[PDB]
């Protein structure tokens, strides 16, 4: 119930996200070819994708990932890694709803993710912006899996409106704030958020609704299973803030489900 091109972007940004976990990708010098062990990102490799800036342990609660240049596809890709360190895992646990009026009046977000981002904003924005300047025809995309998708979503909400569009693609990403931010995230202009979920994966269900959190709309729910290659028919676009017809359901949740977004993700060494 999605087109072939959309599907193909979903898989491309999923492989970009997967590539934020391979250790070598977080301390590579600028200009080098992004590569991944275990066939974690063939399209990424296929595109001739170089690093603009590779980073490890940035700001607060460990910001890890990279900023890449993709000439084949005309992209300036900023990718955040999900949870891997003690700090990362612990940053998840700072779940109080902080006010973030600077992004949107009345909206509130996870204290640890609102924080990490804030910790690295200025530098990463700078760098996003010098590439933007140098290649004005390239499409800016922010992405990430798990915590890395929450980093992506917040940074997108923050940096839009600075003169170029920012698309965001998050995979199995946690809820990031309250109903007012979820609302902001659904209608914001200057980029589209594509929030992809996998079957009953547990992570997009946390923190729970009992905690005051909500999800932006819409949701791209992949329904095929763990280790089963996905197809364009496998994805259904579920409409509505806090819909219950996708991953936000009252059933038993699943962990492995998180590691399979079109291919293995979160497993790169």
Q: Where are the domains of the chain?
A: 1-269
Phi, psi (degrees; rounded to nearest 5) at 103? -85, -55
Task: Name which CATH class applies to 1-269.
Answer: alpha beta
Catalytic residue among 54, 83, 116, 146: 146
- Could you confirm whether 146 is annotated as catalytic? yes
| Residue of 62, 158, 201, 234 with catalytic role | 201
Distance of CA 258 to the CA centre of its chain: 13
For residues 147 and 138, give the distance between their C-alpha atoms in angstroms, rounded to a whole number. Answer: 26
Q: How far is CA 119 from CA 11, 91, 176, 207, in A?
A: 29, 13, 17, 22
User: How far, in Å, CA of 221 to CA of 51, rounded?
Assistant: 31
- The four Cα atoms 231, 39, 155, 139 give a dihedral, to 10 degrees, of -70
In 170-204, which positions are buried (b, 16+ CB within 10 angstroms) versus exposed (e)? Answer: bbbbbbbbbbbbbbbbbebeebebbbbbbbbbbbb
Resolution in A: 2.3
Sequence-ordered list of residues with C-beta below 8 angstroms from that of 51, at least 6 positions apart, any chain: 25, 28, 29, 30, 31, 32, 34, 66, 67, 68, 69
Q: What's the angle, vertex CA 26, arms to CA 24 and CA 174, rounded to 5?
A: 120
* Distance separating alpha carbons of residues 130 and 208, to the nearest angstrom: 38
Q: Is residue 258 annotated as a catalytic residue, yes or no?
A: yes
Task: Return d(Cα 46, Cα 72) in angstroms, integer.
Answer: 9
The approach used to solve this structure was: X-ray
- Please confirm, yes or no, whether 122 is among the known catalytic residues: no
Residue among 215, 170, 214, 223 at smallest CA distance from 196: 170
Distance, in Å, from the CA atom of 79 to the CA atom of 52, rounded to the nearest integer, reads 12
């Amino acid at each position: 119930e999605v087109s072939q091109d959309l599907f193909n972007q979903f898989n491309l940004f999923a492989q970009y996200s997967a590539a934020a976990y391979c250790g070598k990708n977080n301390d590579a010098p600028a200009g080098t070819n992004i590569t991944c062990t275990g066939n974690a990102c063939p399209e990424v490799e296929k595109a001739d994708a170089t690093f603009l800036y590779s980073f490890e342990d940035s700001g607060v609660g460990d910001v890890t990932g990279f900023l890449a240049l993709d000439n084949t596809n005309k992209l300036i890709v900023l990718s955040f890694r999900g949870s891997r360190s003690i700090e990362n895992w612990i940053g998840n646990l700072n779940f109080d709803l902080k006010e973030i009026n600077d992004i949107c009046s009345g909206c509130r977000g996870h204290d640890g993710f609102t924080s990490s981002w804030r910790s690295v904003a200025d530098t990463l924005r700078q760098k996003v912006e010098d590439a933007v300047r140098e290649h004005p025809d390239y499409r800016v995309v922010f992405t990430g899996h798990s915590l890395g998708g929450a980093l992506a979503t917040v940074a997108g909400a923050d940096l839009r409106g600075n003169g170029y569009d920012i698309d965001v693609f998050s995979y199995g990403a946690p809820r990031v704030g309250n109903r007012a931010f979820a609302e902001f995230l659904t209608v914001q202009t200057g980029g589209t958020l594509y929030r992809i979920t996998h079957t009953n994966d547990i992570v997009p269900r946390l923190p729970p609704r009992e905690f005051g959190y909500s999800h932006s709309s819409p949701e791209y729910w992949i329904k095929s299973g763990t280790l089963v290659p996905v197809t364009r028919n496998d994805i259904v676009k579920i409409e509505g803030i806090d819909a219950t017809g996708g991953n936000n359901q009252p059933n038993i949740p699943d962990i492995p489900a998180h590691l399979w977004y079109f291919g293995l993700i979160g497993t790169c060494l």
